[PDB]
């Protein structure tokens, strides 16, 4: 997307990649399960915006602690995807009890 002084122009960039990885070994802070906005929409025709990832760490007020961990996410192996490429993974849920859907 190019802003040239009067009008936004949007063009394809065919040789540009997008980095995707999964944190399948649980060594990033887990921000899911905190009831945040930005999930998939309820209705299949809606287009959603991917939320920005962020984590909190230890604090002493607004300052930092020596045990505060910083996580670079380009220090993980990620799959780079141009147009034509795709991403896929599978996951098996552990043995969880049935949710009691009765009164």
């Amino acid at each position: 997307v190019t802003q040239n002084d009067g009008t936004t122009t949007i063009a394809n960039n065919l040789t540009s990649t997008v980095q995707v990885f999964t944190d399948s070994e649980y060594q990033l802070p887990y921000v899911l399960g905190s009831a945040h906005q930005g999930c998939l929409p309820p209705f299949p025709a809606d287009v959603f915006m991917v939320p920005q990832y962020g984590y909190l760490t230890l604090n002493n007020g607004s300052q930092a602690v020596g045990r505060s961990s910083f996580y670079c996410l380009e220090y993980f192996p990620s799959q780079m995807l141009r147009t034509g490429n795709n991403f896929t993974f599978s996951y098996t849920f552990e043995d969880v009890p049935f949710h009691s859907s009765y009164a």
Binding site: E25, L28, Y30, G66, S68, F70, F76
Partner: protein, 103 residues
């Protein structure tokens, strides 16, 4: 609650006792029990060999961690070391919680 490993079957009690060696009995029979014994003690060596299972860390943490270290600042006595009288002392309690892990 004092910390440690709760064991239904812990390492068993190892009980030790000098066998009573009597002094010279009277040359006539006495049905009373012996109150006179040869004064003696025992000594020896004792070995305990425990195998411990470890759990290695898999943190993707970028910044360095808090670790237990000795200080390089000079002193009259090195920590965890005998003094000039040969008396071993431990200067501080060392806990075991120095690495970090996310919730």
């Amino acid at each position: 609650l004092m910390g440690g490993f709760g064991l239904k079957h812990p390492p068993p009690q190892i009980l030790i006792k000098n066998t009573p060696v009597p002094a010279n009995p009277s040359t006539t029979f006495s049905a009373a029990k012996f109150a006179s014994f040869i004064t003696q003690y025992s000594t020896g060596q004792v070995s305990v060999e425990i195998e411990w299972e470890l759990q290695k860390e898999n943190s993707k943490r970028w910044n360095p961690e808090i670790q237990y270290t000795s200080n390089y600042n000079k002193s009259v006595n090195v920590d965890f070391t005998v003094d000039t009288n040969g008396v071993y002392s431990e200067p501080r309690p060392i806990g075991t919680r120095y690495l970090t892990r996310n919730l």
